[PDB]
Amino acid sequence: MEAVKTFNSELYSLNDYKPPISKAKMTQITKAAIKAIKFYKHVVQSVEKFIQKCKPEYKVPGLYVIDSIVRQSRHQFGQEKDVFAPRFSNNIISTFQNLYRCPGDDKSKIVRVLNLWQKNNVFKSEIIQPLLDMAAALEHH
């Protein structure tokens, strides 16, 4: 499972950089995840693990990894052939619960991604709506 370990290295190396994360570093992470597509389940698992465990300033970067991988895979393998979005959708509620533990000023950056996902049909709207509701309810509490 060499391909996964290279992805794991790229993903974890986010900790060596102060957010905002560069286009270039995001690309490296994404290139690594695509190269590991035989183990896409393990990639999704590592990403979900990073998001659960990382410092608060890294939650939005973790979300950008999901966005970046999903979009690249749809571009590279076809919208309807993409394995990553359907796989990420399985634990997405749990994932966003962890993402919303980000700094106050970072909540809006998560909604921006959700709005883009909805606009560009990246995830099914039925998947996206409760995630948006979650962000809204956070502002009333």
């Binding site: 560069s22 286009k23 570093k25 979009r71 571009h75 590279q76 883009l116």
Partner: peptide
């Protein structure tokens, strides 16, 4: 990174 930035070729 920008979530509107075109995917790499």
């Amino acid at each position: 990174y920008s979530p509107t930035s075109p995917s790499y070729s």
